[PDB]
XYZ file of N, CA and C in Angstrom:
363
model
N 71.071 178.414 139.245
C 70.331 177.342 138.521
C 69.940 176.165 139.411
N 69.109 175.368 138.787
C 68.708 174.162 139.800
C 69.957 173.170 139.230
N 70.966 173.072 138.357
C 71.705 172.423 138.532
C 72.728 172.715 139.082
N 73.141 173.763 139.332
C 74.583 174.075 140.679
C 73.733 173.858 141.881
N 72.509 173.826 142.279
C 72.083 173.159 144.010
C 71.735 171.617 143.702
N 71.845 171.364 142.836
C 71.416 169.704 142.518
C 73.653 169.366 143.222
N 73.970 169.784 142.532
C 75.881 169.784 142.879
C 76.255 170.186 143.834
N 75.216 171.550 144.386
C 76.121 171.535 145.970
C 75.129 170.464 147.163
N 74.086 169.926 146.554
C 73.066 169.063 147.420
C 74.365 167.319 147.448
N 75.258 167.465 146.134
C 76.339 166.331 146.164
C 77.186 166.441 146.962
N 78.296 167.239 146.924
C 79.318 168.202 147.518
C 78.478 167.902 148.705
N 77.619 168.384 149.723
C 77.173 168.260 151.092
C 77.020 167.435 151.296
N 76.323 166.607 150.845
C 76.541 164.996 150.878
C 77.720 164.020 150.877
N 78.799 164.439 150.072
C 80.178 164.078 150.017
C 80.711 164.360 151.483
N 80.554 165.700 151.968
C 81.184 166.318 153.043
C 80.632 165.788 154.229
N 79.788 165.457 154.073
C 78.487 164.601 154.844
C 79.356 162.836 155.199
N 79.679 162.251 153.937
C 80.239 161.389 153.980
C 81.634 161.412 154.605
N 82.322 161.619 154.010
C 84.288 162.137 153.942
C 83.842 163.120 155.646
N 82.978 163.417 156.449
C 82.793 163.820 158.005
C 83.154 162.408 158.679
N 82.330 161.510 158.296
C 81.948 160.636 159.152
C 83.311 159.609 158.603
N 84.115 159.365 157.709
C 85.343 158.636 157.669
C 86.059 159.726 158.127
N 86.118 160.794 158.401
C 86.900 161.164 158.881
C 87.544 160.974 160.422
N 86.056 160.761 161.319
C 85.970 160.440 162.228
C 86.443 158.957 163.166
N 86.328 157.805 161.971
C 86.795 156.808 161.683
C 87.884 156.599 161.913
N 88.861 157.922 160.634
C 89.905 157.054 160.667
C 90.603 158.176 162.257
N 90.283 159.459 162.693
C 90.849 159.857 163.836
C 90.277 158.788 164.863
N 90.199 158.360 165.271
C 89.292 157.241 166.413
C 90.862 156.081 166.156
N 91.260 155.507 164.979
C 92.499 154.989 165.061
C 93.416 155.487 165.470
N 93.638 156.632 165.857
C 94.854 157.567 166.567
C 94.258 157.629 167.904
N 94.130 157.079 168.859
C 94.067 157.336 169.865
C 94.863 158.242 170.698
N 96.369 157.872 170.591
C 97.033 158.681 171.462
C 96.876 160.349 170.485
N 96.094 160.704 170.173
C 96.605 162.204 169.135
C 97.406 162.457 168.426
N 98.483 161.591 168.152
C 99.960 162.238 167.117
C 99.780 163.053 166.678
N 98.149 162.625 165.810
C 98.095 162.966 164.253
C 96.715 164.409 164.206
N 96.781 164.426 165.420
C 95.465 165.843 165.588
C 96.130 167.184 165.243
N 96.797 167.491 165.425
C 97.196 168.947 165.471
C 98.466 169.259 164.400
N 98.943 170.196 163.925
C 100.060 170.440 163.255
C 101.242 170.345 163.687
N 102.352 169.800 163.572
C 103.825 169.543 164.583
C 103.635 171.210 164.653
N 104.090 171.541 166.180
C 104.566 173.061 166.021
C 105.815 173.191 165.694
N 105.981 174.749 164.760
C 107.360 175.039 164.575
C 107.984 175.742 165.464
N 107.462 176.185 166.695
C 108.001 176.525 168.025
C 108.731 175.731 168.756
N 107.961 174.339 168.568
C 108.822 173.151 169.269
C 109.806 172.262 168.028
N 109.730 172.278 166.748
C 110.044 171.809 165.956
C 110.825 172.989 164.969
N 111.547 173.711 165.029
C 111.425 174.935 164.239
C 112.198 174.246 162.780
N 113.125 173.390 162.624
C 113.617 172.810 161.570
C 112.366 172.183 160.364
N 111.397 172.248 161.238
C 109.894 171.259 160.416
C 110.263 171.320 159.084
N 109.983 172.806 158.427
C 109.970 172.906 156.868
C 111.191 172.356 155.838
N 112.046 172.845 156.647
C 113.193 171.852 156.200
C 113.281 170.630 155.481
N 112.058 169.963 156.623
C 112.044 168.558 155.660
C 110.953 167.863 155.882
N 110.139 168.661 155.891
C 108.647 168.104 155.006
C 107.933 169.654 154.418
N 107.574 169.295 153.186
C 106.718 170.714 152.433
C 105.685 170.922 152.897
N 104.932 169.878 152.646
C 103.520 169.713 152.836
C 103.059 169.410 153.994
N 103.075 169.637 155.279
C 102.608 169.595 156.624
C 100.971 169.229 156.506
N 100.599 168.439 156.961
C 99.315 167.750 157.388
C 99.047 166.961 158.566
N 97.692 167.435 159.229
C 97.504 166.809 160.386
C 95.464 166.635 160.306
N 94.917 166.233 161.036
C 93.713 166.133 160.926
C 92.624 167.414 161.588
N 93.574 168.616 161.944
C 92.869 169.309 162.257
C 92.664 170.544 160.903
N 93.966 170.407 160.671
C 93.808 171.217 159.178
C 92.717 170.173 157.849
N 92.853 168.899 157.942
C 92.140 168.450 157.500
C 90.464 169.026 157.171
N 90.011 168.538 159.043
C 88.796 169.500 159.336
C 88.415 170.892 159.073
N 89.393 171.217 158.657
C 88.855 172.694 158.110
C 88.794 172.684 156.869
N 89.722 172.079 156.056
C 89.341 172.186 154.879
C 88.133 171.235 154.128
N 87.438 170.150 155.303
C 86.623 169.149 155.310
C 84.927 170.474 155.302
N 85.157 171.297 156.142
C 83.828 172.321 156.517
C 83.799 173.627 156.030
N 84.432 173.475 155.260
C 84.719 174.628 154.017
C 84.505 173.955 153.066
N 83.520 172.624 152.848
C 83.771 171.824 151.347
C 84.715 171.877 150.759
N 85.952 172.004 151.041
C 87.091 171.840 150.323
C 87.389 170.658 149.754
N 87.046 169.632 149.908
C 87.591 168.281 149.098
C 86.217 168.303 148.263
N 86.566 168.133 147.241
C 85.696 167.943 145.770
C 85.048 166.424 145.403
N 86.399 165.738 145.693
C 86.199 164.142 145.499
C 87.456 163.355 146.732
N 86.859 161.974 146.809
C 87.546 160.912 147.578
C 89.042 160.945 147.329
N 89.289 161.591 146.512
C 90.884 161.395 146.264
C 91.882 162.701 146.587
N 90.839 163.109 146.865
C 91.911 164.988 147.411
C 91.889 164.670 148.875
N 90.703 164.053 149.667
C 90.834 163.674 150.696
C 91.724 162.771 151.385
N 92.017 161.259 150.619
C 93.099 160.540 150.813
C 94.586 161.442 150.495
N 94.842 162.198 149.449
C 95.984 162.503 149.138
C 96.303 163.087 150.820
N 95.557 164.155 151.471
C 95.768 165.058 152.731
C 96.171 163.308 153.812
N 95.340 162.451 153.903
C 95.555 161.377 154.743
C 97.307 161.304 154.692
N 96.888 160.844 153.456
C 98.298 159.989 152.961
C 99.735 160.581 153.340
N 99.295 162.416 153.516
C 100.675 163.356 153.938
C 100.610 163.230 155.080
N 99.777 162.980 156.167
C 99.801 162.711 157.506
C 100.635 162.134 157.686
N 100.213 160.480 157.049
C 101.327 159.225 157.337
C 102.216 159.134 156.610
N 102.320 159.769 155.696
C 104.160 159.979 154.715
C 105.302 160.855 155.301
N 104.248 161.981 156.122
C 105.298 162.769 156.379
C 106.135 162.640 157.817
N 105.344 161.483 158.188
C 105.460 161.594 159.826
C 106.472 160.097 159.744
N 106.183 159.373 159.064
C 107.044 158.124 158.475
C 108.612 158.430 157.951
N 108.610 160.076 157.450
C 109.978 160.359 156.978
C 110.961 161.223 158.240
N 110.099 161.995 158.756
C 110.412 162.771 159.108
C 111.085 162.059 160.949
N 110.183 160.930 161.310
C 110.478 160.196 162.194
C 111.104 159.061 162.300
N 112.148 157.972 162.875
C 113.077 157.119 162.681
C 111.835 155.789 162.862
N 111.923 155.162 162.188
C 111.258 153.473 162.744
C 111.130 153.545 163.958
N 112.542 153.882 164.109
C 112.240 152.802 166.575
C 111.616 154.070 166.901
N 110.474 154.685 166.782
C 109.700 155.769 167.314
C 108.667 155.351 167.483
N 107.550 155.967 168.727
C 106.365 155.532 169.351
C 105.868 156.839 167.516
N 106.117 157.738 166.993
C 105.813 158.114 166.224
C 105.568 157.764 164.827
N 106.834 157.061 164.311
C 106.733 156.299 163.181
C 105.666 155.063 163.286
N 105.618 154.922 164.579
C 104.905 152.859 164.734
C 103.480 153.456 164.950
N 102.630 154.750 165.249
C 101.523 155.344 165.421
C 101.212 155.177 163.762
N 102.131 155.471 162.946
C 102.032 156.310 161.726
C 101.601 154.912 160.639
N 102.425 153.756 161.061
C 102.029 152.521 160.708
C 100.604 151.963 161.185
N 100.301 152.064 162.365
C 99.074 151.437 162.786
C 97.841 152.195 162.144
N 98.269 153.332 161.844
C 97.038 154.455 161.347
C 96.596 153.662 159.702
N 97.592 153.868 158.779
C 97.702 153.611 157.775
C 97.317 152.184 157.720
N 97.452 151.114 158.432
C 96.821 149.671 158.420
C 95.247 149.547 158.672
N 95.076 150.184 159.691
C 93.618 150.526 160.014
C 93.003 151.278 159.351
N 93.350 152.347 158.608
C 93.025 153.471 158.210
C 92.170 152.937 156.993
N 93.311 151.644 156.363
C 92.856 151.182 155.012
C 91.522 150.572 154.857
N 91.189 150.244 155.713
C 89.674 149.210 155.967
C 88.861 150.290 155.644
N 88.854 151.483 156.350
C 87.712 152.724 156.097
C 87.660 153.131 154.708
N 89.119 153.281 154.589
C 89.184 153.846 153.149
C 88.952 152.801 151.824
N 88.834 151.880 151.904
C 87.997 150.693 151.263
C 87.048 151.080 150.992
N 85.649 151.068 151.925
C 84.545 151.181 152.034
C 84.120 151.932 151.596
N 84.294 153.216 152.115
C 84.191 154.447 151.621
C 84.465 154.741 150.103
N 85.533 154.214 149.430
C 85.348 154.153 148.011
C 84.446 153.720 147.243
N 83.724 152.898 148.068
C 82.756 151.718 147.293
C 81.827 152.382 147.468
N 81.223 153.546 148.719
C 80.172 153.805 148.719
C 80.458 155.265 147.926
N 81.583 156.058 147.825
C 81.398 157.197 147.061
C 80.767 156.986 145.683
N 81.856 156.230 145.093
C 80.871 155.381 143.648
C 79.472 154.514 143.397
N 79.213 153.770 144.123
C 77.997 153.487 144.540
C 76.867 154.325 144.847
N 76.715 155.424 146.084
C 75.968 156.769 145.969
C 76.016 157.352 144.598
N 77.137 157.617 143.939
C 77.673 158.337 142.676
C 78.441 159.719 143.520
């Protein structure tokens, strides 16, 4: 129908959008923490104690597969980045204090970006 390409012409556009904050908020990680998945080769206890493993490369895939629907499935994946890396790591860590600076900075993008998801519609 012309209204499921009128919805995926949104959806691409969304993905279009939620690309380019994505980019944003990786550019605040400079050193990488937060690029790749902890390995369980080097980490093998991981599951133990975090469920939900998130990093920004799994992100990206599920970002180019249109997988996020709306602004808020996208933050939830953010949000496990810096929750899980906040629990799983002690304060006096160059890891935990990455995980803070992300989430401070992070918030400015993710501001904006709300205003313009609703705003576009």
């Amino acid at each position: 129908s012309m209204e499921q390409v009128a919805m995926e012409l949104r959806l691409t556009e969304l993905t279009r959008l939620l690309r380019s904050v994505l980019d944003q908020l990786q550019d605040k990680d400079p050193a990488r923490i937060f690029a790749q998945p902890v390995s369980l080769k080097e980490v093998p206890d991981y599951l133990d104690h975090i469920k939900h493993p998130m990093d920004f490369a799994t992100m990206r895939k599920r970002l180019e597969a249109q997988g996020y629907k709306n602004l808020h499935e996208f933050e939830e994946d953010f949000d496990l980045i810096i929750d899980n890396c906040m629990k799983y790591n002690a304060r006096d860590t160059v890891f935990y204090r990455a995980a803070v600076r992300l989430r401070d900075q992070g918030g400015v993008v993710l501001r904006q970006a709300r205003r313009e998801v609703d705003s576009i519609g």
